[PDB]
Amino acid sequence: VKKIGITQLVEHPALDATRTGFVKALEKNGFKDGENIDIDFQNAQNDMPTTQSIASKFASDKKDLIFAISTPSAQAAFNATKDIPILITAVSDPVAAGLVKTLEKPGTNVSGTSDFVSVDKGLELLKIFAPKAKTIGVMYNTSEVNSKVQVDALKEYASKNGFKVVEKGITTSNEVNQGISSLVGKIDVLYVPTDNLVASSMPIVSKIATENKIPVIAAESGPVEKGALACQGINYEKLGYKTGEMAVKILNGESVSDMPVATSDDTDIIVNEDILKALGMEKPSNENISYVKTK
Numbered sequence: 066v067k068k069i070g071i072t073q074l075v076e077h078p079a080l081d082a083t084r085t086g087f088v089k090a091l092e093k094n095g096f097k098d099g100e101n102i103d104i105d106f107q108n109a110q111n112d113m114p115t116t117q118s119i120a121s122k123f124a125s126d127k128k129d130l131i132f133a134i135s136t137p138s139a140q141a142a143f144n145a146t147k148d149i150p151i152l153i154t155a156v157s158d159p160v161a162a163g164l165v166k167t168l169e170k171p172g173t174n175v176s177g178t179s180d181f182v183s184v185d186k187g188l189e190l191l192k193i194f195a196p197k198a199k200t201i202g203v204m205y206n207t208s209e210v211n212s213k214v215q216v217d218a219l220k221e222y223a224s225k226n227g228f229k230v231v232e233k234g235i236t237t238s239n240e241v242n243q244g245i246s247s248l249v250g251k252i253d254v255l256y257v258p259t260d261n262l263v264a265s266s267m268p269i270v271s272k273i274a275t276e277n278k279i280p281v282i283a284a285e286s287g288p289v290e291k292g293a294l295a296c297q298g299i300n301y302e303k304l305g306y307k308t309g310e311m312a313v314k315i316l317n318g319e320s321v322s323d324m325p326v327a328t329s330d331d332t333d334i335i336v337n338e339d340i341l342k343a344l345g346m347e348k349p350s351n352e353n354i355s356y357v358k359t360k
């Protein structure tokens with residue numbers, strides 16, 4: 066029986082979706098929990114020390130494979146073991162996180178999928194929902210390398226395309242209230258990168274932003290379900306399913322160190338119709354938009 070450890074940072078929609086897809090891929094390929102695999106699922110509940118203790122225990126348990134969901138969980142798994150294969154998902158920038166040498170040839174015990182998406186995809190939506198906006202706010206966790214890379218990308222785009230960026234770096238969930246509140250009066254739109262801290266506090270961000278008539282564009286649909294206005298993002302269940310197919314390969318003997326990291330080029334526009342209505346906006350004509358209601 067192959068023993069798989071799954072280390073997930075926290076329940077937020079994107080991370081949950083990757084776990085769902087990964088398990089379905091393994092099952093479709095004949096690997097079934099309680100039969101020829103054992104899945105030990107561990108949630109850190111957003112606690113950074115717990116990402117490290119989960120990973121430590123998976124290494125001392127001698128798991129056959131570790132599936133790590135998010136940058137923090139992956140970094141912890143990599144710190145814990147350089148021998149057990151680690152498959153990642155929902156990692157924005159595996160190279161910047163120190164997990165792989167290159168995407169095409171990791172050269173380490175880590176491979177999997179990246180949730181990289183260009184800032185351009187979300188900022189395209191300004192033409193639709195805030196066509197006169199000139200100042201973009203971004204709140205993010207200064208401890209997440211995934212977020213730092215995306216903020217740099219945002220600033221590069223803004224410098225190219227005539228926008229101002231106002232940053233609010235935080236490190237704790239207790240800072241969210243004053244952080245979003247402080248951006249009121251100073252921004253035309255909020256961009257939410259794939260930041261685990263902010264994604265976990267989206268209902269708060271949404272409530273204050275929407276009361277202040279600030280559109281919030283997120284990088285992916287989880288925050289939209291939790292009260293952001295819109296996104297043009299990837300499908301995280303599919304990303305997880307791809308990672309499970311790569312697991313099948315590793316369980317069957319393929320070398321993780323030569324397995325290329327996979328990404329998705331397929332995005333979909335999803336809008337929260339409740340938030341749209343609260344902002345006094347009309348549904349645009351665009352046939353490719355799908356609508357969600359608040360989770």
Ligand SMILES: N[C@@H](Cc1ccc(O)cc1)C(=O)O
Binds near residue numbers: 136137180211287
């Ligand atoms: N990209 C994040 C995970 C994440 C995904 C979706 C989000 O909305 C937020 C965070 C990481 O590298 O850890």
